[PDB]
Enzyme design. Structure first.
Site, PDB file in Angstrom:
ATOM      1  N   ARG A 108     -10.668 -11.348   0.929  1.00  0.00           N
ATOM      2  CA  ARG A 108     -11.367 -11.867   0.458  1.00  0.00           C
ATOM      3  C   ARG A 108     -10.851 -13.494   0.565  1.00  0.00           C
ATOM      4  O   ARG A 108     -11.212 -14.806   0.489  1.00  0.00           O
ATOM      5  CB  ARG A 108     -11.249 -11.745  -0.560  1.00  0.00           C
ATOM      6  CG  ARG A 108     -10.728 -11.836  -1.547  1.00  0.00           C
ATOM      7  CD  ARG A 108     -11.102 -10.742  -3.026  1.00  0.00           C
ATOM      8  NE  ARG A 108     -10.944  -9.805  -3.023  1.00  0.00           N
ATOM      9  CZ  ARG A 108     -11.260  -8.653  -3.221  1.00  0.00           C
ATOM     10  NH1 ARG A 108     -11.112  -9.037  -5.022  1.00  0.00           N
ATOM     11  NH2 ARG A 108     -11.554  -6.854  -2.972  1.00  0.00           N
TER      12      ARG A 108
ATOM     13  N   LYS B 259       0.911  -1.172  -0.225  1.00  0.00           N
ATOM     14  CA  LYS B 259       0.052  -0.437   0.106  1.00  0.00           C
ATOM     15  C   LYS B 259       1.055   1.184   0.285  1.00  0.00           C
ATOM     16  O   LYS B 259       2.294   1.422  -0.040  1.00  0.00           O
ATOM     17  CB  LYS B 259      -1.196   0.722   1.395  1.00  0.00           C
ATOM     18  CG  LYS B 259      -2.292  -0.841   1.292  1.00  0.00           C
ATOM     19  CD  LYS B 259      -2.576  -0.918   2.435  1.00  0.00           C
ATOM     20  CE  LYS B 259      -4.224  -2.004   2.665  1.00  0.00           C
ATOM     21  NZ  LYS B 259      -4.834  -1.586   1.601  1.00  0.00           N
TER      22      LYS B 259
END
Ligand SMILES: C[C@H](CS)C(=O)N1C[C@@H](Sc2ccccc2)C[C@H]1C(=O)O
Ligand SMILES: C[C@H](CS)C(=O)N1C[C@@H](Sc2ccccc2)C[C@H]1C(=O)O
Ligand code: NA
Ligand code: NA
Ligand SMILES: [Zn+2]
Ligand SMILES: [Zn+2]
Ligand SMILES: [Zn+2]
Ligand SMILES: [Zn+2]
Lengths: 486, 486
Positions: B336, B262
């Site tokens: 996920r 990130k």
């Protein structure tokens, strides 16, 4: 050469073999069972949307394309919010017609597949391609109903599909051709060809200035391309005084972002930033062709958003028609600026409902992509009507929130009554919608952010790659039902 | 020093002056009308959420803060999807309590304002601040019900608010402190303190490996921080065999994105990437404190997502518990991945419903921001229950689409059964939800993407800046009603 598209359903457990539609079985009978015979020989069964071509079965149909229609009894899919059967038909037929076109056959007869309108939509939407500016084009295919028992339904499908294709053409056409003036002239000729119970006013800049649409004017001034405020009237109601339904569409023929200039990557797609105007105008043209017994007014502020020595400057404060001041912090949030003035004007018609459409935010695309058009509305009745219509058309809508939560983020403005961009970067489609709501006092207003459904790659099977013209058919269906129900 | 928070409503047209709540009028009577007198002298009326402080009115209450409650009869707002009155109370009381705290008063009595639970939630949620690691802290304020007639309702509010505050604490706490192990231990002590009808299993890596949770393990391995699979059981049903409701929460204690690292800006907020686990675990703790007559199982895969010599590598293919292979194209789409295994495991409990929560996508934030939690579910019944509960709590939910349209974009995978990122960048929350659905076969599953409501700046008036712990109360309300209704 004449081609034939026939449908076959997926085999049910109780059946010994997949069943043809009535037209398929009849043709098979006509060719003494050769269709079934060759299909059996060809291999695995045809699943939904799949196709297989058989040659020389009949002297009149050298090419016969059988398409899989899926489950015959496929109806409303509670999880997908659409009539699955209709979607299967649209996709299968589109696929079949594309196969016929690839074989360079100029004429094709299409199996109604138990739903002539869906079949027609699949063929007409499926075959469409904007190739006016190309030297090399695919063969023009004339699709017609196979048989003569489902004519009205078939033509209804052609009409709905043609309406969407008009929107697609308007959106796909390069901006140097599809200028505000040209867009207005094309819509005008189409609406007038649809019915004489119409009036079209291609309002010039002088009128816009007279109407004190400072917000709209601020966007347009950066470009040398003259802005126009398209106003179309369709007087379908038996009662001339019957309040009209008003549609408003964002008509940015080209959006460079202006001084808050966009990145170069895929900016060409911004030639479709007038998709809002395209869809609502096309829906009205189609409503006129359907001769719906209702009065409808279409409003489309049209202009380009370009950078120049006189373009909107970040921080500039402009005054909307309603006297509200707007701080233009980002000149690329221009759609809401022109819509502010158009929405204000929409109220002067004392409309029954006000529905605007706009390729308004990238946030909408990030939110739902091309899965569905985002619908912001202060009326659950209106939402439900749009939703129900979308189930039929398959061009889905999904409700998005009109909360004061978002309003607060746009009225928190340093210089004016409202800022054209939220104070936070979150919920971009919601704050954009909140901004529009500041120019709406009507109890039945719906804002459709169609930015996510502006284009199609392969998501909608029956739409080739390019501008999608969505959700034109859903608007048409809405109008049709409103003319019958509401 | 003891402070007092009293409410006053907005004046109705038929009234000669704004009306105090019962407690306000009683106090005014107690001070021989001095409260009304000074309020009148102070100036303009108090509007919703506004406060004004009056000193020396009573020897026992040197500081009295009157707060505006808005319209007394404010009920369900059809446009905002919440009970407006409750929201007015939460905000007004929170504001009042913050004023008392600023005056450094350690004790405050709070007007029930016609809804003790809402008043309690406003005070408890409003006063909360995670300041364990600060040398300089505000005075600790003990808020108690003013009067003794609305005790259960008040305590219910404290309980609901405390549940949310637990989630906020877990989310706000820096990741070097709030590790998977620590999170599990804190949830364990809280659940066990809530009821003895519980079992907590802080499953170690060996168990996770035994359970073949290769997807979850792939995420955890990059970090040196041991992963744990938190499994909590609350046996509230009179019938031990009664199928439980299963909650699943994304527990990434810290997300650096891993190899798909990130950006540095605000990455510190990723210490709350375990908000999904925090909210569902806190809701279960609260359900236990409410002694709800239902069986509930909480599942929270917990680990960090860090870059290292053994971290997940883009393109790697991992095998979920159900045998499905996943292509990890982006290691920052790790939530996920761990949820795939947790959701698979959730089915082994033959649950009545499966609800997972996760700070899953930035797309959700771009979609709805902090206005509402996005709910993806294959059950309209479940959606409606969550929606109705949210109206009461004010911690809104908004439904998002679970369309095959999105599924197609994640199963279109180069190397495996499913790609952990869609082929297109559009509808990020929808494709993420579609990915999760590939690990769900249950008929009543709801996925809550809480990424947009992970934090609060000033959107929710009664929540100070920081991690929000949303929508914990909505989950609690859902459970409460389910234990009574469903
Ligand atoms: C699709 C729309 C309309 S043309 C569009 O491009 N927007 C609208 C705003 S959003 C925005 C972006 C940054 C800060 C504030 C708002 C500007 C532009 C964009 O995304 O950068
Ligand atoms: C909030 C979530 C979970 S931690 C997150 O940060 N995502 C998930 C994906 S989205 C994504 C971004 C680019 C390409 C494909 C998917 C990766 C990461 C991100 O936005 O770059
Ligand atoms: Na165009
Ligand atoms: Na944390
Ligand atoms: Zn723009
Ligand atoms: Zn635009
Ligand atoms: Zn991540
Ligand atoms: Zn994450």
């Amino acid at each position: 050469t004449k081609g034939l598209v026939l449908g076959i359903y997926s085999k049910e457990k109780e059946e010994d073999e997949p069943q043809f539609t009535s037209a398929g079985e009849n043709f098979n009978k006509l060719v003494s069972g050769k269709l079934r015979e060759i299909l059996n020989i060809s291999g695995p069964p045809l699943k939904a949307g799949k196709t297989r071509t058989f040659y020389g079965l009949h002297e009149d149909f050298p090419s016969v394309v059988v398409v899989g229609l899926g489950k015959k009894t496929a109806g409303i899919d509670e999880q997908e919010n659409w009539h699955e059967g209709k979607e299967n038909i649209r996709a299968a037929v589109a696929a079949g017609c594309r196969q016929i076109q690839d074989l360079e056959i100029p004429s094709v007869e299409v199996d109604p597949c138990g739903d002539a309108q869906a079949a027609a939509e699949g063929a007409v939407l499926g075959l469409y391609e904007y190739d006016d500016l190309k030297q090399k084009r695919k063969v023009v295919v004339s699709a017609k109903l196979h048989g003569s028992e489902d004519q009205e339904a078939w033509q209804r499908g052609v009409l709905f599909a043609s309406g969407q294709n008009l929107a697609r053409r308007l959106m796909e056409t390069p901006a140097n051709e599809m200028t505000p003036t040209k867009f207005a002239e094309i819509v005008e000729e189409n609406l007038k060809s649809a019915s004489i119970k119409t009036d079209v006013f291609i309002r010039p800049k002088s009128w816009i200035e007279e109407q004190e649409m400072g917000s709209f004017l601020s966007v347009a001034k950066g470009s040398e391309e003259p802005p126009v405020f398209l106003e179309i009237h369709y007087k379908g109601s038996p009662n001339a005084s019957e309040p009209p339904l008003v549609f408003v569409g964002k008509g940015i023929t080209f959006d460079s972002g202006g001084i808050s200039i966009k990145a170069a990557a895929n900016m060409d797609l911004m030639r479709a930033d007038m998709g809002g105007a395209a869809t609502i105008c096309s829906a009205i043209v189609s409503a006129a062709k359907l001769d719906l017994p209702i009065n409808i007014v279409g409003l489309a502020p049209l202009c380009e958003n370009m950078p120049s020595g006189k373009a909107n400057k970040p921080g500039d404060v402009v005054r909307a028609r309603n006297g509200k001041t707007i701080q233009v912090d980002n000149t690329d949030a221009e759609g809401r600026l022109i819509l502010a003035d158009a929405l204000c004007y929409a109220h002067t018609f004392n409309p029954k409902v006000i529905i605007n459409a706009a390729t308004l935010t990238g946030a909408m695309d990030i939110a739902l992509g091309s899965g569905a058009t985002g619908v912001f509305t202060n009326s659950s009745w209106l939402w439900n009507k749009l939703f129900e219509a979308s189930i039929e058309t398959g061009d889905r809508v999904w409700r998005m929130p009109l909360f004061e939560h978002y309003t607060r983020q746009v009225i928190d403005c340093q210089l004016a009554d409202v800022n054209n961009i939220g104070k936070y970067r979150s919920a971009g489609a919601c704050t954009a919608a909140a901004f529009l709501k500041e120019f709406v006092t009507h109890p039945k207003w719906a804002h459709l952010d169609i930015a996510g459904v502006m284009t199609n790659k392969d998501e909608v099977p029956y739409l080739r790659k390019g501008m999608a013209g969505r959700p034109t058919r859903t608007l048409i269906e809405f109008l049709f039902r409103f003319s019958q129900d509401s």
